[PDB]
Amino acid sequence: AGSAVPFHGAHQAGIATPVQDRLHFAAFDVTTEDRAAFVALLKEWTAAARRLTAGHAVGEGAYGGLPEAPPDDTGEALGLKPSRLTLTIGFGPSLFTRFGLADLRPEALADLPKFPGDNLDRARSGGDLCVQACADDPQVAVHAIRNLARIGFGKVVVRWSQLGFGKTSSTTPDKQTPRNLLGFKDGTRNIAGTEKDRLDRFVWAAEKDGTPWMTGGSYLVARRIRMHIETWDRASLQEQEDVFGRDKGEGAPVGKAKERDEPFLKAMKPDAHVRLAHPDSNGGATLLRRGYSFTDGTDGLGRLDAGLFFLAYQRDIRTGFVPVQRNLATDALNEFIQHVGSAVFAVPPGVRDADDWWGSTLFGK
Amino acid sequence: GSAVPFHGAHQAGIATPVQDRLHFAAFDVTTEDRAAFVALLKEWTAAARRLTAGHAVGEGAYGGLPEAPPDDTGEALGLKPSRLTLTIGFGPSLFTRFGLADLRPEALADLPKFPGDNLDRARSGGDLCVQACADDPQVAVHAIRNLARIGFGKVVVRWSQLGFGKTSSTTPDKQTPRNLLGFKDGTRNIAGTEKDRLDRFVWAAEKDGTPWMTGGSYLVARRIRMHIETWDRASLQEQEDVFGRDKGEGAPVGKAKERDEPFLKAMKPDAHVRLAHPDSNGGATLLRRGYSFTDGTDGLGRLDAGLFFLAYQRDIRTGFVPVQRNLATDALNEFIQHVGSAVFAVPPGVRDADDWWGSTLFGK
């Protein structure tokens, strides 16, 4: 409908929120050594985010100013609706080496171990901070990231960015589950925005967890995963279904007639993705997945290049992504994918009201 | 609307309404066997019929023999036709194969080198193209991916470009879209409703000199990067002076409304609109059908974004060429760079359920 998603709250939007059709994800590095200047930026960014998420232009607007001045807003979202835009900020481990923050780095913001099979591009990994922009309109998402980058010129730079052309995740099990580029429904067994108890248990950090400023935030893992499309497209229908443990057309667990019927894991192959990723196979570890598909032109060698930009939110990286990904070491899916970029971020609690600002719990004041 | 008819005197995706998203692929041929290529064209035509109606190619994406790879890769299951159009074109380089050298249309002219060109050959050219336009990007991607799969062994993908325009579920269809410079883009263009203009400026006629192309058109593609960060540092007046229109309303200098006809004399001499207008080009007029693109961040931290420019015309020598030549002194040149280029002869339409892409070139 193009409606707005509320920006303020106990949590940042863009996590439990219904998954929007498009993604523009940007990782930034910090260039200023001046803590007071960074705080000033965080406040200016928050003010811009309030405008952008309501479908308004930043600052004084896109036109009507002094002819000799550059417009405050770049203008390409004029005439567009809010489009369910959310903007979610996160702080990477590397941020805590700056501004005297070292003693505030959360233990739950754990560096990932190395995993077998990966080929991580360092230039498109890491980052001192991130902004996840999600919207139903790609032009609204690009506009938001572009204007935040411009406001930040001189104090932060974009390290890397990723566009997602379509979602591969669901926080709304009452709606149709999207399909990834392997042709399978993706998001069936996730966490719903309406599952407040499971979000509290698996997603939101608590004060007793050890880092008071993170109370009401979450921890994000991003993995850019290339898909070996040519090899997958040669596989038989049975081979593809065996890889996942679900049938392709309906997406039901093996032996079942309906997508949402609960899996009987023992009937899956022992290396099936669902069998290895399920919480019951991981001592209860559960993720909020929120990823998107991507294309990246060609491989320069006659083939389309595409994949999945995987995003997982959890209350503690040590009890979420890390154990699950370790259990995927024998995943049959590994034959068809390769992880090629990675980053982790501590996503702070929400912007409480119009006087609050991104990062206020961490920076004080 | 939900779907666009695939059959016609013309191929759809030219004069038909502009869809929200693009997946454009250029292919190169990897077979020397003309009969095998004709067999592929027929197979691709059969697939396009299915795809443009929201159906899976071949026997489908599941339900077949378990030991067989499915005929369709499945990522459009549960989606809609989404106004998908699939438009095929033949590049100059195709005509060196299959004995077609004497059938290359004279109106399929190689573009000259233009001032400021910085073309990436890897993202230029192509023996063939398929333009997939749809409202849902996944429908467009699925079509391209499956056509490439069907063709693998006889064609490969040379380059691939995704693009976007308006989001029609939330943006009114009459509203002109804005490009990534923040200006309305498309105000003075040929419309699919202007049947006589299409005959004058877009469709090839038999007497033009290439009978098999009658009812086709010629396509120019230019991948045009914008220097986003420098543009955003320009003053409002500088930006408006570059185009000859105001930014907010998109009206010409000295007018009040977007669609008021321009008074070219009131624009700066090197304004884009003043140089591009048909009155500045001996009447030359284009059907522009391009899409914005954003491919991420370059190695310098700058937005890799711009316009994937597409123009259809009755003859490349009388459409794109004179107009682009007239843009040599464009004030816009400071903020843009042409980085990829290709031309294609887009054949006439698939006439009925027994016809096939390229039947007039290869013969029935």
Ligand code: HEM
């Ligand atoms: C290209 C890479 C991947 C693809 C194509 C993929 C695909 C799928 C599909 C088709 C399903 C079944 C439907 C669903 O319930 O969502 C699924 C489930 C799941 N995936 Fe993945 N996945 C990928 C990577 C990962 C990674 C990296 C992780 C975690 C480290 C992960 C964790 C999970 C979990 C936890 C489930 C739900 C299992 C359950 O509780 O039933 N997946 N995935």
Ligand code: HEM
């Ligand atoms: C990034 C590159 C470009 C941008 C941002 C751009 C933008 C614009 C804008 C804002 C307008 C005015 C609104 C309209 O009538 O559509 C316009 C008009 C036009 N442009 Fe472009 N343009 C670009 C490249 C080109 C190229 C490469 C050509 C042809 C070689 C071209 C040909 C035209 C024509 C024919 C018009 C209509 C002029 C008239 O008849 O009033 N443009 N363009």
